[PDB]
Amino acid sequence: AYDDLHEGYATYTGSGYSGGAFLLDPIPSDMEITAINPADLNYGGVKAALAGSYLEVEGPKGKTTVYVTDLYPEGARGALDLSPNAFRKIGNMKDGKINIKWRVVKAPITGNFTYRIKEGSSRWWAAIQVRNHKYPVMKMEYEKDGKWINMEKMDYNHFVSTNLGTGSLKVRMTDIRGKVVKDTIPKLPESGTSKAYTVPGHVQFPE
Amino acid sequence: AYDDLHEGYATYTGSGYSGGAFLLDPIPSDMEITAINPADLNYGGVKAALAGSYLEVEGPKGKTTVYVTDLYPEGARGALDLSPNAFRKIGNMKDGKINIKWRVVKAPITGNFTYRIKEGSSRWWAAIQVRNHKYPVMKMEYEKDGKWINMEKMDYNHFVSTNLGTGSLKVRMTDIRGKVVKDTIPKLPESGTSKAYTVPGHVQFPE
Numbered sequence A, B: 001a002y003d004d005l006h007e008g009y010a011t012y013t014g015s016g017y018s019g020g021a022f023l024l025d026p027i028p029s030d031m032e033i034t035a036i037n038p039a040d041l042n043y044g045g046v047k048a049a050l051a052g053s054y055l056e057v058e059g060p061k062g063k064t065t066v067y068v069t070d071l072y073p074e075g076a077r078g079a080l081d082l083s084p085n086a087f088r089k090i091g092n093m094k095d096g097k098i099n100i101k102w103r104v105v106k107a108p109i110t111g112n113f114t115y116r117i118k119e120g121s122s123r124w125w126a127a128i129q130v131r132n133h134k135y136p137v138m139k140m141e142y143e144k145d146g147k148w149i150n151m152e153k154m155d156y157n158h159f160v161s162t163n164l165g166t167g168s169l170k171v172r173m174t175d176i177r178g179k180v181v182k183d184t185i186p187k188l189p190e191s192g193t194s195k196a197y198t199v200p201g202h203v204q205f206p207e
């Protein structure tokens, strides 16, 4: 059915503010964040499906919302590793591990997607990340010669393809609800950029 | 390689000195070279098997030896597209096409292999080309955790693999006669190299 909660346990950690597997840096220190177990992270057989999602997390002392910035490698199904500023709002940190119920919620954000084009990217091979997205990005495609080509999502929260073609890149993104939106990204470099770079986008998933 | 024989036709072209498919630049402008039909290029099911090979070619007026630098995309079985300085030695330039016989021969070179590490190569993905080899290179393997891993030869005359591991790279090369030599290459970088570079090798195929 429509919007189920997930039972699990929360622990806490100070990692994930920097060097998180989803390459979402910089994370401001006042942000409530979490790492997420692999089974839940990879919903639908899509690697990093929940990367950059937001979760409402309910514990014994209340509820709070966290930004998913990292993998919780040894986490069981249902398990989250929150930042302590988030954890304290829903449980006593003396307890170390707490019972929780969580679910994906609409991101508390404004504006459009922002894209990050990974170092190494070119017309030959590219890795494109979506940031500032209101719901998990389950799918990304690009058009080439009138056909839409699926992009595999990677563990490091970018969508990848090869031989994408020349000129501007028409892309389309699908969320966890199945809503599809469409955008354009400027032509990829002749050859691999030494640095990742940012492209502010011009669409957002519907409310 | 010791013995071999092909019958076909040759034409001639000015291409292949620069920007040839096999990424063998720079080629001296007065070197004797040829482009080669796809069927014979991809001998034994190896893409670009004969890239960087040397052929002895016989026409009506004599024989000469040529360096294979490019693909002859439209050539039929046995067909070659020679540089005009090579065509001149074995045929009448006033003909647009000639009967030829040819065979893979020992490279008229001295010294050991040279490797070219393609731009963007790293421990995660690498494309390695062998240069200055006496016979066609049919196979390249590298060692990883005590096991030998085969690298796919690409159309662009490099061998490719992924997750090659850290540290210096033990490789082994097999020619078209089935001769095998082994060597070591310096470690690959942690991120895609910004520029292609060459590295001196320390072995050569036997005479």
Ligand SMILES: OC[C@H]1O[C@@H](O[C@H]2[C@H](O)[C@@H](O)[C@H](O[C@@H]3[C@@H](O)[C@H](O[C@H]4[C@H](O)[C@@H](O)[C@H](O[C@H]5[C@H](O)[C@@H](O)[C@H](O[C@H]6[C@H](O)[C@@H](O)[C@H](O[C@@H]7[C@@H](O)[C@H](O[C@H]8[C@H](O)[C@@H](O)[C@H](O)O[C@@H]8CO)O[C@H](CO)[C@H]7O)O[C@@H]6CO)O[C@@H]5CO)O[C@@H]4CO)O[C@H](CO)[C@H]3O)O[C@@H]2CO)[C@H](O)[C@@H](O)[C@@H]1O
Pocket: A021, A071, A073, A119, A120, A121, A124, A125, A156, A162, A163, A192, B021, B118, B119, B120, B121, B122, B124, B125, B156, B162, B191, B192
């Ligand atoms: O999280 C906790 C967990 O951690 C675990 O460890 C993790 C660790 O935490 C992670 O950091 C790490 O994950 C990531 C890692 O996987 C990642 O790997 C990437 C890397 O970043 C990239 O840089 C690299 O990029 C290369 C591509 O892979 C490669 O495929 C691409 O290929 C291109 C070439 O670039 C291009 O030059 C080439 O050549 C062209 C030809 O295409 C062309 O052909 C055409 C002809 O011209 C034309 O005539 C004909 O008609 O058409 C032809 C086309 O069909 O020819 C021209 C010349 O003519 C050539 O120039 O073409 C290729 C096209 O595909 O190049 C890329 C260059 O960058 O990719 C790799 C992946 O492969 O790195 C990141 C770093 O941030 C890392 O995060 O993983 C580890 C391990 O899991 C722990 O294990 C665990 O314990 C913890 O719990």
